[PDB]
Design a binder for this molecule. Structure first.
Ligand code: HEM
Ligand code: HEM
Ligand SMILES: Cc1cc(N)nc(COC[C@H](N)[C@H](C)OCc2cc(C)cc(N)n2)c1
Ligand SMILES: Cc1cc(N)nc(COC[C@H](N)[C@H](C)OCc2cc(C)cc(N)n2)c1
Ligand SMILES: C[C@H](O)[C@H](O)[C@H]1CNc2nc(N)[nH]c(=O)c2N1
Ligand SMILES: C[C@H](O)[C@H](O)[C@H]1CNc2nc(N)[nH]c(=O)c2N1
Ligand SMILES: [Zn+2]
Lengths: 405, 404
């Protein structure tokens, strides 16, 4: 057949061909000799202009004016601006389209059926760390919406030739502290040991609980970052209980409502937005399987298994599997009871299958990272497990970027 | 740049250098990764160079590289290729190459065992009838009354003139799939096509959910022939549950022996189109995939109803809860019938040890993360957090076309 990657769904026996991958302008880490698909993080002048043109072309297509006079005039404005200044600036509607396209383009995101529905707060006028803080509080307020979560991104000023970057130092707007103990263990979240100790070095007076919310470390151009405590009433949390295991509530477990990534770079048309925090709502397995059960995170599997009276001395009891299920169930139940938006891994992957279909017709493919899309418990019970996926980088994109310190 | 491989649970890093030894492309390019794809969409100097490479691999393994022995063997292979366009392996080389093919299989989580493989040389097979005898002896040996032992039986290689020796079945043991004129399937829907071939070639079909198929065996350029495996040869395990009494009432069962019979074994450029091999199961293959896949026996819902779960909503996690109990039934019943099996936690732990051995021994280990991480409880096992580099080394097991 066709000269494009053939893509098979083994459950349904159906076939598609990804033609969108031809649009990829950027190489990933794989070659004919070895697949590096599983690596988590594998290792301007005219350069700007050609990314800018590509982006402007994408914009005019999406509003159906390719080749139009408005299109050619915008192209000219952009080269003119790059010609005099070395850089250029997005119209408001170009930013909104680009931020949605970045999300639509994210191969690791299973919640992309939602991509068309994103509130884009334009904060390209921000000029201080105090002001970043107001913008961020406003984002959290809008996004949380007392539990009826709404997807959102707030975009701060782009990287500028020889000026410092806007950066949020924290990896998420909400994080729990990880306190290194004298015995070498960690109280709270071990994922956050470094950012915790940075908060302290910067004058935060540390708590000592398992679920202490971190302050934000916010850097405005060419300044040391400044510390800002989130008002407790802005951070919605959900205490965790199980629908039938009455003792589960006694564990004093909890998680926050709003997953908001704050340390990624949004690239649109060669422009780099180094601070552009975005948020959605949780898929339950991120909480109940990874955050609570990873051995290098809260690691609560054994404690829960002991409460359920399972045989933890032998793998073949499946004590780990049975505890994980209940922890995941408690997450779903507690969020549901609290009326905070959450999606379970079945409903999420089913909707991602629908997204794959929508995108097949719309664009002729969808870049997708199978290892991240398939949930971390019950993989083959979800339809995505059986679906081949082609992974490639399209721009606009969310990118990892080196920590500012 | 050789790839840096990181474990995200432990924070340790290694560098894969083994991949430099790869001489065959996989599906990926810098523009797109096709690692999740199940099947590859895709003269004498060629054969001669793989032959020398394999002979060198061999003498190196017995610590004898450079010896008169090594040198004269390279001369033999060269003299045989130059004259006939092909050559033949010595039995010790076959034995070494079969073990390496297994060591090199990126999709296999049970490679900790790679050195312990019984190799039956069946290259003096000249008829389907003889293939059947060898196959029977393999099953008998590998089954070993439930104390399962890894084995391979290697039939005669491909040859330029003629058709291949082939086992048409994908496994030595498979349950019939009977398509009901009204859409549905009775038995294993993965086996509809091979069931229909058997019937067409004169097999009297049954009407059960777990009817063991006969084997269709093909000697070169002959129609395949049909051979019923003696029931006492196929060990089966009735499935029951340690605490749920009604589970046994389901009538479920599964065969002891996983024996793959349609893959091509490639050693030193030579191709062995019929080289069935077997080990023992990991419980999730049966419990999760074979019983719970929607296009397989698909019993999730029946188990969920028997368990009295709320089936109306994904968010009760009824699927997850039934799957777990099903996997537990498999482990329990195999253990009760004293038949070798391994659960996915023990298997992935052993694979981590294998990665470490291989790093020390060879500087890397080819692994296909999507196939190594089990189909339930992925992130609960250590392999989920382990970066992996996938590439093709030879000797190798490969897919080959269906012979019909
Ligand atoms: C609407 C609800 C959403 C759901 C349920 C969701 C779901 C997910 C999940 C489960 C992951 C994997 C996370 C992990 O394992 O750490 C993910 C990754 C991601 N999603 Fe979403 N998503 C949502 C909204 C968003 C939004 C609004 C954006 C940005 C505008 C976004 C962009 C991303 C990106 C960039 C990643 C990759 C993160 C990384 O590489 O670390 N998603 N998504
Ligand atoms: C001793 C116990 C063994 C265990 C527990 C084991 C485990 C597994 C598992 C779980 C798979 C994935 C199968 C699937 O999802 O369909 C697999 C694939 C494989 N194993 Fe093993 N293995 C064992 C022995 C062997 C032996 C003896 C060989 C060959 C000599 C072998 C070669 C393979 C190959 C080639 C594959 C990939 C097959 C394919 O692509 O369809 N393994 N192994
Ligand atoms: C917007 C959104 C919604 C949702 N339901 N889930 C998310 C998940 O965010 C978690 C992030 N993927 C992870 C933790 O990013 C942090 C990170 C840090 C490092 C060092 C590497 C890496 N790959 N990722 C994001
Ligand atoms: C030796 C061995 C041990 C063990 N525990 N498990 C096995 C599993 O064998 C199952 C096979 N790998 C499955 C059926 O793959 C067959 C297959 C068929 C098709 C059409 C494509 C494909 N990639 N693979 C094999
Ligand atoms: C090694 C492996 O790439 C790594 O553990 C990945 C696997 N899949 C994942 N999938 C998601 N959604 N999130 C993750 O953090 C990871 N971790
Ligand atoms: C599309 C996807 O690669 C396919 O479903 C794979 C995923 N992982 C697998 N893993 C194993 N061990 N066996 C399988 O058959 C599969 N199927
Ligand atoms: Zn790849």
């Amino acid at each position: 057949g066709p000269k494009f990657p053939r893509v098979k769904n083994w459950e349904l026996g159906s076939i598609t061909y990804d033609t969108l991958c031809a649009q990829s302008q950027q190489d990933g880490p794989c070659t004919p000799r070895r697949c590096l698909g599983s690596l988590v993080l594998p290792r301007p002048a005219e350069q700007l202009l050609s990314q800018a043109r590509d982006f402007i072309n994408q914009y005019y297509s999406s509003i159906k004016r390719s080749g139009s006079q408005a299109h050619e005039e915008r192209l000219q404005e952009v080269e003119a601006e790059v010609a005099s200044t070395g850089t250029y600036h997005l119209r408001e509607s170009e930013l909104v389209f680009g931020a949605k396209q970045a999300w639509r383009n994210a191969p690791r995101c299973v919640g992309r059926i939602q991509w068309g529905k994103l509130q884009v707060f334009d904060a390209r006028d921000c000029s201080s760390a105090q002001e970043m803080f107001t913008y961020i509080c406003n984002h959290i307020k809008y996004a949380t919406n007392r539990g009826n979560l709404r997807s959102a991104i707030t975009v701060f000023p782009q990287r500028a030739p020889g000026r410092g970057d806007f950066r949020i130092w924290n990896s998420q707007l909400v994080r729990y502290a990880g306190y290194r103990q004298q015995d070498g263990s960690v109280r709270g979240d071990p994922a956050n040991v470094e950012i915790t100790e940075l908060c302290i070095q910067h004058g935060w007076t540390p708590g000592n609980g398992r679920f202490d919310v971190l302050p934000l470390l916010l850097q405005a151009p060419d300044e040391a970052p400044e510390l800002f405590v989130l008002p407790p009433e802005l951070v919605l949390e959900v205490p965790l209980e199980h629908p039938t295991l009455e003792w589960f509530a006694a564990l004093g477990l909890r998680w926050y409502a709003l997953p908001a990534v704050s340390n990624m770079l949004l690239e649109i048309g060669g422009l780099e937005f180094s601070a552009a925090p975005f948020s959605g709502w949780y898929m339950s397995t991120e909480i109940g399987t990874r955050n609570l059960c990873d051995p290098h995170r809260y690691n609560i599997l054994e404690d829960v298994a002991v409460c359920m009276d399972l045989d933890t001395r032998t793998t073949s009891s499946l004590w780990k599997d049975k505890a994980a299920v209940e922890i995941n169930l408690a997450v779903l139940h507690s969020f549901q009871l609290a009326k905070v938006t959450i999606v379970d891994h079945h409903a999420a992957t089913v909707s991602f299958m629908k997204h794959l279909d929508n995108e097949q017709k719309a664009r002729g493919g969808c870049p997708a990272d199978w290892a991240w899309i398939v949930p971390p418990i019950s993989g083959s019970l979800t339809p995505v497990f059986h679906q081949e996926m082609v992974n490639y980088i399209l721009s606009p994109a969310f990118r990892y970027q080196p920590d500012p310190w």
